[PDB]
Amino acid sequence: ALYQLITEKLDYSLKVLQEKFHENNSMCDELKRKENNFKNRLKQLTK
């Protein structure tokens, strides 16, 4: 009983954590694009 339920809990937790990792990667690259856009906006503004 300790075995099967805990192993299924962990198998579901793997998906739970991988979802948040993928979404964190998406938020990270969107942050990268945002900061690049702000820096290029500054570039054009100075020009």
């Binding site: 793997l14 954590l17 990792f21 990667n25 942050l31 945002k34 900061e35």
Partner: peptide, 23 residues
Amino acid sequence: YHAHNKNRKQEIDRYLRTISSKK
């Protein structure tokens, strides 16, 4: 996965702080 998730969260916090600083 938890370790790298925490790392990404910290980096995202830094990036958001920088964006707010320039914003």
